[PDB]
Design a binder for this molecule. Sequence first.
Ligand SMILES: COc1ccc(CN2C[C@H](O)[C@@](CCC(C)C)(c3ccc(S(C)(=O)=O)cc3O[C@@H](C)CO)C2=O)cc1
Lengths: 99, 99
Amino acid sequence: PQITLWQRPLVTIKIGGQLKEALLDTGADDTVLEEMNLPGRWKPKMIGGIGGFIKVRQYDQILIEICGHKAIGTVLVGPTPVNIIGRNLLTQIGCTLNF
Amino acid sequence: PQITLWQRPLVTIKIGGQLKEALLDTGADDTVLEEMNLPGRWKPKMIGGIGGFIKVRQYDQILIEICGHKAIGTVLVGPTPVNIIGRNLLTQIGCTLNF
Ligand SMILES: COc1ccc(CN2C[C@H](O)[C@@](CCC(C)C)(c3ccc(S(C)(=O)=O)cc3O[C@@H](C)CO)C2=O)cc1
């Protein structure tokens, strides 16, 4: 699909069998979701947002469906204001910017 | 153009007689640039997200040239870690997400 930017580019994602709303974010290198339960082990990561840095939990090889497109990749979990789909997964679903 | 998301989508912008590098950010409501003076009146604003909030100066009806395309809108100036072109100007140059 083609998504315009007059409103926030919010889409439905599915992860762990549950639907969530998330922001398609070309400014985000990585994908970060609000506190939730994911399987396996995690590693520490620091990410820098508009306001400064925060600690998040990095989970690898996680199954996540984004607007119907299946991806498997790295998902970070931490105190984000909104669920964010970053470039690591936008590339998996074939997303580009066009004008 | 069609801009890949393999790397950060950085472009050259022209604003207030200066050439700068900026990030095309679909996750940003606003356009935020590093400290600089702009013409006209300004008012303080707080913007935030991951890391917390930062105080910026809001200038309205500012002309920017983004990758060849002229656009007019609100520009925020303050201690952003990177120059960001947000949705308020991305719409004006006809920028969309496509997959
Ligand atoms: C490494 O992986 C991640 C890094 C940061 C984030 C959180 N994000 C992504 C948004 O593109 C960004 C960009 C911040 C910029 C310095 C790289 C952002 C910019 C402007 C605005 S604004 C105030 O203009 O709307 C909001 C915004 O993100 C919020 C939605 C969440 O913080 C941010 O803070 C994620 C992953």
